[PDB]
């Protein structure tokens, strides 16, 4: 009774003192929402699972998973989203696999993309630090952890580098994403860790044209962890974000399914999911409007409209 | 003399204080007119009997009467009228008898009609409350009182629900109509109670094509009670409102009967009542113009023209 | 000399003060013309004798004379003229003698004619007052004075009624004509009093087809009194107005008689009076043009052309 | 030398000042031409002698001469010419000799001719004044001066009348011609005075069919005086104007005499004068064309062609 | 350790005392930058090699080198730059080779250029002194050392003159440049000595249109000596300064080479070096903006923008 | 050595004592400048030759020379200059030759000019004395010496008069100029004596439009004597002062000759001397600005600008 009031008073005061003393995000409740500066992953479901609506800026991010699970796709979409915000992006490459026609399809502006193919793991982290320290680079993607071979071996690395790097990152608000194939110092320094995997084939006839994808946020220091997103990745197209908008939009009653049609605000979008997705692809301002309504319904920060 | 002046002064001051203290409509004179936000019943005669020109918005309405007397017809017309105003409508159904071809003939837009077929009487009133609380539903029809069986029985309900519901209704201006076949808590919470019954057959040859209908306003908190309306309900067509317009229009000298013809503003409408009704059906803007003149002559608020 | 100037100055100033104090028309000179809103009697000669070109609107008119002298004819023509102006007319009948084929021949539109056959003299004047008070009736004919029997007798009337009626008439600009067969309160309230009588037969062979008619304006408050008009009334046709136009037109040099022909503006109208009258009947716009020239020559207001 | 220049400068300036001060026509040179609104006399030779091509409008004209010299003929032709211009004419007759078959032969439209046969000389001049004052009469012929007997005698007249009449004539542009048989006040008020006389017989066999006629302009205030015209007047036909056109036309080289033929513009008109005159009578538009060329050659204003 | 701190303390204090006692620039470190009032040489590379961004004002300058190496070009550009600053310039000529079409192409305003062709070496230095002493001449070019023949010979000079001249120069802030063909007193008095030579031909086909040029700063009292600049001199155009801006701009990452294009601030300048140079020639405010960014990157004072 | 120092010390002390004892101007060096209250002669060259920039105020001036050499011109210009200073002027005339259109062209305000034509030489000097003694006349011109005939002769004069007059002149600061045609007492009392003569014709075609003029200051007590001025006097225009400004201005480097143009402060004045003179005439404030710079360069006091 007064026991319960006394107990809730004490919990609140402790939670507040913990946040003051150890920093925001140090203790959360598992289903907490958010009251934030983020860059979209290009997946609405993943932006929602992240709680703040995207990857947090000025932080270290790790994305790991088996090859062809969607890691590079997610980072190229993040680059395209950051470029849309007006930000400058760099790709530090130790894998030599980038396909720039694909990057372009995902919205990356290659004219403005910085690229580095470093001579060693040391050199990769030092170049990464130099770009962070410039104060003029907004997002860096490092591909990939394992490939970051020490000079001695070519003829604790991660750990001292990450110490130096995180120092720089905190001063300049640069976002840095490491792609890791499936390293340990990363586990503590990262504010967000994503576990991505293929969960099924998508097929046209017996031609596979894509993959069902699951991403789990296994570490999240800016909103509660362990949320998941499920979306399609289509060959040549990346995340089917328009599909997410229709699915989540209909689920949360923003978008109507009227017989065979998807409709929004009393107007038809398309007959069947493929037609409706294509219409949203052709009408990106409408797509963004609907997306933002879905974000608001779920308590997730909006993206830029306009 | 001065006795009479003193007496009239005292009556007026008491009536004014009663209205201030107990609310408008608490004491009226039986033939009072009105100085109001209403939705039409689809019957001109009933809108006139209601005094304010329709059902009052933000209030509870009860419509009761024997089966096939016209209750569902009146509520579907009210839905069509509310949709014409731009309002969102819901039908909460415990009778499983709705005919949507008929609803469409009466002008209901099924695309925009919310529908619920609840699992119990409790569930019906809770869903009704949730829709009222949304602030986004303008009119709810609940069919029907008796059918609202308590969960325990399936395996005071009305009374506590109506307490909660009327609280919500007053905050959001939602209109809620209960259809009752021939419950007690309704008698006090309802601002308007309608008693509807069939009073005769309408025939083509020996084929009955409709029914003469009488509606009595047995409770009216927004204008004086106990007025009545008489109109035809035709199978497949609902209230013969064009017939009411010609009848009341001619009665109150707005519409002329010139020999065999009905005429308005010096122009023929049709030869005989059937032809004139059909012409008004084909010329709804004229029908509304004449209807509104009749309303004005009787001291009843107008509907939207245009 | 200066005596004459002083005397004319004094007369003028008195006449002006009398008009200001007692109202226009209170003192006139017997051959005064006019500087007016009127409705034609259907007789050009009578419209001229009235000075203002017709009966004055917003006033009481009395027309009296022996039966079959032309009273009803004059009032039906006045109705037809008022309807031509767009005005609404009523006939209050205590004589039960109206012939509506004749009324139609005289140009009355029966569709728009209000009719009343009152239960008593009181009822006649009360209905007359109600029509005046509507503000929507332009001309009322009351037939006839003597027939207006008091209720008590059926089982001062005129006088108190005329007091009330003239009050209403002055507010609404309604014209009211009383037909009187040959009452006293009428003598003062009437602005115009007409004395009409038959003065001779008109014959085809030994078949009488009409009557020579004399109307004397015995009271005139809107222009000088005691002028007279002489015209034919033909069975089935009313006043021979085309005959008046030719006669007065030729008299005042507007219309030419060239040998056997009547001519206007250098063009033949017809050979002999009957042919010329028929031509004007067939060419009413020409008839009106010539009529208006005659009115202008005599200092009488014009009618509508077009 | 400079004497001559100084003298011509002074003369011109005086002539200009005289015209400004005393009016146009006050001083002229005897052979002056003209730079005018006129009505033809029906004689080309006389229209030329008048300088302005006809009698001046808005002026008083006197025509005097022995009986049968051609006075009435000239005035009837002037009437016919004025009617051709669209003007309204009046004949004020104290002689009782008019032959209207002759007037018609000369082109007078009797339908439009006003006629007066006054009771006295006074009455004649007063009617003349009233017609002038109308502003609607273009030409008045008064026949004849001597016959204008004073009332007293029947049981200075001309002089006070002419004062009043000339006042009216100047305001309204009416032309007034007085025929005088062979009065003194006329000598000064008239702008033009014509002296007409027979100078010889015209014969067919020993049948006289006409008369050689001489007209002298003894007073002319609109162009120089004392010019003369000589022409034939034929019984029943008036002035032989076609003969004048051929004579003056050939004299001034407009018309050719080719052997026995008269020709104009390279085309034969007729063999011998009689045939050529008749052809011009039958072809009045050609006659007018040739007449106007002759007028132009002589510096005389043209008539209407068409 | 503390040995090193003690040693660095002592060096700094000595360097500071040397500067105070012998003057700024007396001891420098070879790669020192600068913390200055300068006039541009018209070569960005040479302005950079000079450290302060141009020739120092209020000082003596020597420029020496073989004929046609670019000496006169550099001094005419310095004149044009000084005139751009609003300064008054003089050219003292003992060589008689000036081409003023070329001077104009290089931006010299001939209207404001003072010119002297002295009678002897003595007279040249005395006129130079008089111009310096005026306090109204900002830059003097003396062409050329060897040609400055003593009067006695025409029928130590430099040394006593330079003593007097440097006294005047220090009081008035006049800049004086001596052109020397390849004198000894100059070696000590000069604050800056430039060694310029042709190092190669520039060709269009087999037509030589210019020369590769090297300038070495062999003496520099205002910033460290022995730096070098390499640039093109084109016949008729002088130093290719726009070429320097593109080269140094791209080298120091201010200007982008994107495929075949040079670009700055995200906007194309031109396809290939010639087109980009011409664009900068046509857009001098942009050229200056880019030049100044390059200066800032290298630690060199800026020029006036605007 | 010390001989030279002793000698220069002695000279200076003697010169200083001579000035104290005999008055300023008693001993000068021939090329001395000046350290003064003056009125301009209207000639810049003459104002410069006078050393103090004009005639000295409060002194006697003699101007002598052959007729038409420019004496009257110089005195009328002096009057115009004195009036410009706000001073009151008088002209005492024994020659009767003054042309006041010319005086006006030279800038004399005739409204304010006092004039006297005395009866004798005695009377002239007595009136001159009375005007001086008023304390209210600033400049008096006496024309002319020879014409100043003694009364006895009409039926030593100069000498006793000049004694009295110079006494008055010294008290009141009046300037008095005597014009003398080519008297002895004048030679000593005058502070300034001018010898003016024509030295050549100025011609347009073979029309002489003016005269080259030389003025020598043969006596000067306020600055060194014997300086000369040469200027044009143009018929109707007086001294060509704008021409002097351009000539002396260009000579002393204030005004530029740039090709065919005269220019000042970088702005064109006119193409050729005539155009430049006219521009300065139209822009008197500029003319004065340039004139004053020339005066300052020569060590001569300035005139009022503004
Ligand atoms: N160049 C490309 N063109 C078209 N689609 C591509 C391309 N690369 C990848 N994809 C799509 O994205 C899916 C995952 O590829 P992605 O490179 O994003 O994963 P990854 O984990 O970075 O791969 P890896 O480990 O092989 O370097 C692929 O299965 C394919 O459907
Ligand atoms: N589906 C329909 N099609 C055509 N006409 C109908 C239909 N339903 C009702 N009507 C007309 O309206 C009349 C009354 O029906 P309505 O359903 O409005 O009354 P109710 O009181 O709600 O009925 P119940 O009590 O049977 O559910 C009927 O007699 C019929 O004439
Ligand atoms: N029904 C009719 N048809 C044709 N002509 C008619 C008719 N009624 C009247 N007239 C003509 O008009 C004349 C006068 O009739 P009117 O009714 O105008 O006079 P009244 O004074 O109103 O008559 P009463 O006193 O008989 O009611 C008649 O003599 C007749 O020539
Ligand atoms: N009625 C006529 N019919 C034919 N020709 C006529 C007629 N009247 C006149 N003429 C011709 O005109 C000539 C002159 O007649 P006119 O009447 O013009 O002269 P007048 O001076 O007015 O005559 P009077 O003085 O006789 O009244 C006659 O000689 C005749 O040739
Ligand atoms: N009059 C000119 N027109 C065009 N280009 C010129 C001209 N003079 C010089 N140049 C260009 O500049 C280069 C060097 O000439 P400049 O006179 O600047 O050198 P310099 O050392 O002063 O010459 P010199 O020693 O011959 O007097 C030439 O090779 C030529 O390309
Ligand atoms: N009235 C005038 N109009 C125009 N120019 C004149 C006039 N008077 C003099 N000048 C110009 O000035 C010149 C000298 O005249 P000015 O009268 O100044 O000399 P002066 O020595 O006083 O003459 P004088 O001895 O004849 O009285 C003349 O040659 C003429 O060019
Ligand atoms: Ca809808
Ligand atoms: Ca009607
Ligand atoms: Ca006619
Ligand atoms: Ca770019
Ligand atoms: Ca004054
Ligand atoms: Ca210049």
CATH of the domain at E270: 3.30.250.10
Question: What are the start-end ranges of the E strands in C7-138?
Answer: 38-39, 55-56, 60-65, 89-93, 114-116
User: Which residue's CA is the nearest one to ligand 5's atom 10?
Assistant: E235
Q: Which of C166, C167, F215, C37 shows the shortest CA–CA distance to C178?
A: C166
Strand ranges of the sheet holding C256-258, from the earlier edge strand across to the other edge: C256-258, C261-264, C267-271
- The answer to whether C62 and C194 are in contact (CB under 8 A) is yes
Separation CA E66–CA E196 (nearest Å)? 8
Separation CA A291–CA A81 (nearest Å)? 15
Count Cβ neighbours within 10 Å for each residue of D273-300 and write b for 16 or more, e otherwise.
beebbebbeeeeebbbebbbbbbeeeeb
Q: Answer yes or no: is F6 within a domain.
A: no
Mutate to test the pocket of ligand 2, among B43, B65, B72 (most ligand atoms within 8 A of CB): B72
Say whether both A214 and A269 belong to one domain. no
Separation CA C41–CA C55 (nearest Å)? 7
- The answer to whether A223 and A34 are in contact (CB under 8 A) is yes
Q: Residue A9 is encoded by which pair of tokens?
A: 């008073």
A297: three-class secondary structure by DSSP: helix
Contact partners, residue B10, CB within 8 Å, separation at least 6 = none
Say whether both E205 and E288 belong to one domain. no
- The answer to whether E125 and E118 are in contact (CB under 8 A) is no
Say whether both E129 and E73 belong to one domain. yes
Q: Residue A176 is encoded by which pair of tokens?
A: 């840095």
Separation CA E89–CA E131 (nearest Å)? 10
Say whether both F220 and F270 belong to one domain. no
Mutate to test the pocket of ligand 5, among E66, E68, E194 (most ligand atoms within 8 A of CB): E68
| Partners of D211 in beta bridges | D201, D233
Q: Residue E251: how many CA atoms within 13 Å on its side-chain side?
A: 12
Say whether both C249 and C213 belong to one domain. no
**E69 C-alpha to ligand 5 centroid (Å):** 7
**C72 C-alpha to ligand 3 centroid (Å):** 6
Q: Residue A164: how many CA atoms within 13 Å on its side-chain side?
A: 15
Q: Answer yes or no: is A219 within a domain.
A: yes
Mutate to test the pocket of ligand 1, among A98, A141, A235 (most ligand atoms within 8 A of CB): A235
Integer angstrom CA distances of residue E192 from C219, D50, E55, E62, F205? 129, 115, 8, 6, 63
Number of independent structural domains in chain C: 2
- The answer to whether D143 and D119 are in contact (CB under 8 A) is no
**A105 C-alpha to ligand 1 centroid (Å):** 13
Question: What are the start-end ranges of the E strands in chain E?
Answer: 38-39, 55-56, 60-65, 89-93, 114-116, 139-143, 175-181, 192-204, 207-220, 228-234, 238-239, 256-258, 261-264, 267-271
- The answer to whether E266 and E232 are in contact (CB under 8 A) is no
Residue E71 among known ligand-binding residues: yes
**Residue D258 structural domain:** 241-299
Q: Which of B187, B249, B221, B302 shows the shortest CA–CA distance to B32?
A: B221
**B19 C-alpha to ligand 1 centroid (Å):** 76
Contact partners, residue F32, CB within 8 Å, separation at least 6 = F51, F223, F224
Contact partners, residue F248, CB within 8 Å, separation at least 6 = F44, F45, F48, F294
Q: Answer yes or no: is A4 within a domain.
A: no
**Last residue in a domain, options B210, B240, B270:** B240
F112 alpha carbon, closest ligand: 11
- Residues, chain A, total? 306
- The answer to whether C155 and C192 are in contact (CB under 8 A) is no
| Partners of B65 in beta bridges | B181
| Partners of D213 in beta bridges | D198, D231
Q: Residue A26 is encoded by which pair of tokens?
A: 């140090």
DSSP 8-state secondary structure symbol assigned to residue E174? -
DSSP D254-292: SSEEETTEEEETTEEEEEHHHHHHHHHHH-HHHHHHHHH
Print the SS3 string covering D60-108. Answer: EEEEEECCCCCHHHHHHHHHHHHHHCCCCEEEEECCCCCCHHHHHHCCC
**A223 C-alpha to ligand 2 centroid (Å):** 57
Q: Answer yes or no: is B21 within a domain.
A: no
**Last residue in a domain, options B240, B269, B284:** B240
Integer angstrom CA distances of residue B59 from A112, B1, B37, B111? 63, 43, 11, 25
Packing angle between helix B121-133 and helix B157-172, nearest 10 degrees?
A: 10
Question: What are the start-end ranges of the E strands in chain A?
Answer: 38-39, 55-56, 60-65, 89-93, 114-116, 139-143, 175-181, 192-204, 207-220, 228-234, 238-239, 256-258, 261-264, 267-271
DSSP 8-state secondary structure symbol assigned to residue A302? P
Q: Residue C273 is encoded by which pair of tokens?
A: 């009076």
Mutate to test the pocket of ligand 2, among B42, B66, B68 (most ligand atoms within 8 A of CB): B68
Residue linked to tokens 């190496």 = E69
Q: Residue D176 is encoded by which pair of tokens?
A: 């007034």
Residue linked to tokens 């007063």 = D126
Q: Residue D197 is encoded by which pair of tokens?
A: 């006389």
Mutate to test the pocket of ligand 2, among B70, B105, B197 (most ligand atoms within 8 A of CB): B70
Residue B210 among known ligand-binding residues: no
- The answer to whether E165 and E43 are in contact (CB under 8 A) is no
Give yes or no for residue C144 CB within 6 A of ligand 3: no
Integer angstrom CA distances of residue D172 from D39, D124, D132, F72? 16, 19, 7, 79
**Last residue in a domain, options A221, A240, A259:** A240
Separation CA C270–CA F281 (nearest Å)? 97
Separation CA B256–CA B263 (nearest Å)? 5
Q: Residue D247 is encoded by which pair of tokens?
A: 């004579």
The helix or strand, by DSSP H or E, that contains position E125, with its residue range, turns out to be: helix E121-133
Quote helix, strand, coil % in chain B, to nearest 5. Answer: 40, 25, 35
Say whether both B230 and B254 belong to one domain. no
- The answer to whether F242 and F219 are in contact (CB under 8 A) is no
DSSP 8-state secondary structure symbol assigned to residue C140? E
Question: What are the start-end ranges of the E strands in chain B?
Answer: 38-39, 55-56, 60-65, 89-93, 114-116, 139-143, 175-181, 192-204, 207-220, 228-234, 238-239, 256-258, 261-264, 267-271
Exposed, middle or buried, E70 (CB in 10 Å: 0-12/13-18/19+)? buried
Planar angle of CA A48, A54, A57, nearest 5 degrees: 150
- The answer to whether A280 and A254 are in contact (CB under 8 A) is no
Distance of CA A48 to the CA centre of its chain: 10
- The answer to whether E179 and E72 are in contact (CB under 8 A) is yes
Give yes or no for residue C180 CB within 6 A of ligand 3: no
Q: Residue D174 is encoded by which pair of tokens?
A: 């009416």
Q: Which of F193, F205, F243 shows the shortest CA–CA distance to F74?
A: F193
Residue linked to tokens 């300037």 = F175
Provide residues with CB under 6 Å of ligand 4. D 65, 67-73, 95, 97, 99, 102, 181, 210-211, 233, 235-236
DSSP C174-231: -EEEEEEE---HHHHH-SEEEEEEEEEEEEETTEEEEEEEEEEEEEESSS-S--EEEE
**C135 C-alpha to ligand 12 centroid (Å):** 94
**Cβ count within 10 A of residue E301:** 18
Q: Which of B57, B42, B47 shows the shortest CA–CA distance to B295?
A: B47
Separation CA A196–CA A66 (nearest Å)? 8
Say whether both E55 and E186 belong to one domain. yes
> Taken in order C239, C245, C250, C252, is the CA torsion positive or negative?
positive
Q: Answer yes or no: is B274 within a domain.
A: yes
Contact partners, residue B160, CB within 8 Å, separation at least 6 = none
Q: Which of E44, E57, E26, E32 shows the shortest CA–CA distance to E302?
A: E44
Say whether both B205 and B265 belong to one domain. no
- The answer to whether D209 and D203 are in contact (CB under 8 A) is yes
Residue F67 among known ligand-binding residues: yes
Say whether both F169 and F273 belong to one domain. no
Q: Which residues are placed with Cβ below 5 angstroms of ligand 8, an ion? A: B 266; C 111-112
Contact partners, residue B202, CB within 8 Å, separation at least 6 = B208, B209, B210, B211, B212, B232, B234
Residue B69 among known ligand-binding residues: yes
Strand ranges of the sheet holding F89-93, from the earlier edge strand across to the other edge: F114-116, F89-93, F139-143, F175-181, F60-65, F192-204, F207-220, F228-234, F238-239
Which atom of ligand 3 sits closest to the CA of residue C210? 31
Q: What are phi and psi of B61, to 5 degrees?
A: -120, 140
E59: three-class secondary structure by DSSP: coil
Record the resolution, in angstroms: 1.7
Rg (CA), chain E: 21
F119: three-class secondary structure by DSSP: coil
Say whether both F236 and F248 belong to one domain. no
Q: Answer yes or no: is C258 within a domain.
A: yes
Contact partners, residue B262, CB within 8 Å, separation at least 6 = B246, B250, B255, B256, B268, B269, B270, B273, B276
- The answer to whether E277 and E285 are in contact (CB under 8 A) is no
Contact partners, residue A17, CB within 8 Å, separation at least 6 = none
Say whether both D124 and D269 belong to one domain. no
**E10 C-alpha to ligand 7 centroid (Å):** 87
CATH of the domain at F211: 3.40.50.300
Count Cβ neighbours within 10 Å for each residue of A266-292 and write b for 16 or more, e otherwise.
eeebbeebeebbebbeeeeebbbebbb
- The answer to whether B154 and B120 are in contact (CB under 8 A) is yes
Say whether both F168 and F222 belong to one domain. yes
Integer angstrom CA distances of residue F73 from C213, C264, F105? 116, 98, 11
Terminal-to-terminal C-alpha distance of chain A: 52
> C-alpha dihedral over A202, A204, A210, A215, to 10 degrees?
-20
A113 alpha carbon, closest ligand: 10
User: Which residue's CA is the nearest one to ligand 1's atom 28?
Assistant: A68
Q: Answer yes or no: is B15 within a domain.
A: no
- Residues, chain B, total? 306
Separation CA A129–CA A267 (nearest Å)? 50
> In the complex, which subunits touch D with 3 or more CB pairs below 8 angstroms?
none
**B185 C-alpha to ligand 2 centroid (Å):** 26
Helices and strands of chain C, counted as H and E runs: 11, 14
Provide residues with CB under 6 Å of ligand 2. B 65, 67-73, 95, 97, 99, 102, 181, 210-211, 233, 235-236
Q: Answer yes or no: is D167 within a domain.
A: yes
B114 alpha carbon, closest ligand: 7
- The answer to whether D48 and D298 are in contact (CB under 8 A) is yes
Q: Which residues are placed with Cβ below 5 angstroms of ligand 7, an ion? A: A 266; B 111-112
Separation CA D246–CA D252 (nearest Å)? 10
User: Which residue's CA is the nearest one to ligand 2's atom 27?
Assistant: B67
F113 alpha carbon, closest ligand: 11
**A166 C-alpha to ligand 11 centroid (Å):** 94
């Amino acid at each position: 009774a007064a026991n319960n009031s006394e107990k809730s008073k004490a919990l609140a005061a402790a939670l507040a003192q913990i946040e003051k003393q150890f920093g925001k995000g140090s203790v959360m409740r598992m289903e907490d929402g958010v009251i934030i500066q983020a860059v979209s992953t290009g997946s609405l479901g993943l932006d929602i699972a992240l709680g703040i609506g995207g990857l947090p800026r000025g932080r270290v991010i790790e994305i790991y998973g088996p090859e062809s699970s969607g890691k590079t796709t997610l980072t190229l979409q993040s680059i395209a989203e950051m470029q849309k915000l007006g930000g400058t992006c760099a790709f530090i490459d130790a894998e030599h696999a980038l396909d720039v026609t694909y990057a372009q399809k995902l919205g990356v502006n290659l004219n403005d993309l910085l690229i580095s193919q470093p001579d060693t793991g040391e050199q990769a982290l030092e170049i990464c630090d130099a770009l962070v320290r410039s104060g003029a680079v907004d997002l860096i993607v490092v591909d990939s952890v394992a490939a970051l071979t020490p000079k001695a071996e070519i003829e604790r690395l991660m750990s001292q580098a990450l110490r130096k790097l995180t120092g720089s990152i905190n001063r300049t608000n640069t976002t840095v994403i490491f792609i890791n194939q499936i390293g340990n110092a990363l586990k503590f320094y990262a504010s967000v860790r994503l576990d991505i995997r293929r969960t099924g084939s998508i097929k046209s006839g017996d031609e596979v044209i894509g993959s069902e994808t699951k991403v789990k946020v296994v570490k999240n220091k800016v909103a509660p962890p362990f949320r998941e997103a499920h979306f399609d990745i289509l060959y040549g197209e990346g995340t089917s974000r328009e599909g997410e908008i229709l699915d989540l939009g209909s689920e949360h009653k923003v978008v109507e399914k009227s017989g065979a049609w998807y409709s929004y605000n009393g107007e038809r979008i398309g007959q069947g999911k493929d037609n409706a997705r294509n219409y949203l692809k052709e009408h990106p301002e409408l797509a963004r409007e609907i997306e933002n309504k879905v974000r608001v319904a779920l308590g997730v920060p909006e993206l830029a409209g306009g």
